[PDB]
Amino acid sequence: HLPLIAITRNPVFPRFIKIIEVKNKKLVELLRRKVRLAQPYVGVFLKRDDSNESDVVESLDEIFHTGTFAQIHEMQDLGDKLRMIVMGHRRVHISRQLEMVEVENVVHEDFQVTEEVKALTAEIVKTIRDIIALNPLYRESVLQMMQAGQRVVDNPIYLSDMGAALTGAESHELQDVLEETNIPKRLYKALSLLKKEFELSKLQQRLGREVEEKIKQTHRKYLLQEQLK
Amino acid sequence: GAESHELQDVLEETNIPKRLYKALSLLKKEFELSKLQQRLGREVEEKIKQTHRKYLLQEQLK
Amino acid sequence: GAESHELQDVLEETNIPKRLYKALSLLKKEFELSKLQQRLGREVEEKIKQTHRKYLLQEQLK
Amino acid sequence: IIKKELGLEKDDKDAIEEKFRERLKELVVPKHVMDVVDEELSKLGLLDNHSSEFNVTRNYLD
């Protein structure tokens, strides 16, 4: 029974640490009000296309129905007066946000043949490795700490959500992954996003190296005219 | 990448030729599985590449 | 890279140490030639970068 | 380079050289003027676009 939190272009990927700093201070009073609660909590969501600050307060339909309830960890306000640490703990999909009623309906349908499925997971991490090998985004220490071979992958769905989170795909693509219910479908969508970003980065780096080669060839052509000199 | 069960199965055989044959069969099976996964990934990446290069140009503009 | 005449002179030599020493001398002479070849271009580079550094200090003060 | 991937350049297949060559292509023209035009076009190609010499050459050719 809490008002929608102004996301303000802060997509909080599941189980991934994020920080939200909204200019509006009303959220500061909202947070202070829930300090007294022995179980402080906050619900993150995702805004729809054509983000509008006014529409959020005036209309509650702009934010998608899917959401992520999380537990407040600490309040800092080092630089700004509003700075909340948000993570992903409980994923939910509201039947009708306008009408709150929430059902922790976490669909994790899996086959009983848990032998060949992990192979695909392996492929996933391989691509992820390649990405961090060619487009370093985050420290590999998370990779070393979290290894599939250690059997510590208790919830592979969260690991796939990590893999999709590291992707540079738009918020709409992650929304379209979330709406997918079948596990293979969401996995394949995330892998397609991984291939997409891989192609983007490969084209970018190919172009950059070609440009540097062209510049050095221009300098060497200056040298070859220095041969006339 | 064979599972530990396959490793134990290979270790079971006593005669050298039989264990070698089983290891070769395991290698062929794993290679076939890897090739199938690679072909599926190639299919997926070509399907994504079916997206007109206009999107690449728009991202370059951005 | 010695001329054909130098190779002919080397082959003319029958004593092994004579031909070995002649080949070594020819090798070092040819390497001196090639070193001059490449050093002249490296000096092109050296002069260009020295001029760039001088004009870079001029740019700093300017 | 992004322009090369997608940009205004490389469109309409229009060049000053070719434009002037086609403009005169329909004119019954002598040869001395032809060689003068060839020299002017060679200079224009040599001359950089931003140079005032280039603008004077372009005006004379026009």
Curated annotation (Swiss-Prot), chain A:
Duodenum, heart, lung and liver, but not thymus. It comes from the Eukaryota. It is found in: Mitochondrion matrix. Residues 2-198 form the Lon N-terminal domain. Homohexamer. Organized in a ring with a central cavity. The ATP-binding and proteolytic domains (AP-domain) form a hexameric chamber, while the N-terminal domain is arranged as a trimer of dimers. DNA and RNA binding is stimulated by substrate and inhibited by ATP binding. Interacts with TWNK and mitochondrial DNA polymerase subunit POLG. The Lon N-terminal domains are crucial for the overall structure of the protein, maintaining it in a conformation allowing its proper functioning. Belongs to the peptidase S16 family. It is linked to CODAS syndrome: A rare syndrome characterized by the combination of cerebral, ocular, dental, auricular, and skeletal features. These include developmental delay, craniofacial anomalies, cataracts, ptosis, median nasal groove, delayed tooth eruption, hearing loss, short stature, delayed epiphyseal ossification, metaphyseal hip dysplasia, and vertebral coronal clefts. ATP-dependent serine protease that mediates the selective degradation of misfolded, unassembled or oxidatively damaged polypeptides as well as certain short-lived regulatory proteins in the mitochondrial matrix. Endogenous substrates include mitochondrial steroidogenic acute regulatory (StAR) protein, DELE1, helicase Twinkle (TWNK) and the large ribosomal subunit protein MRPL32/bL32m. MRPL32/bL32m is protected from degradation by LONP1 when it is bound to a nucleic acid (RNA), but TWNK is not. May also have a chaperone function in the assembly of inner membrane protein complexes. This is Lon protease homolog, mitochondrial. The chain holds residues 123 to 401 of 959 of the full protein.
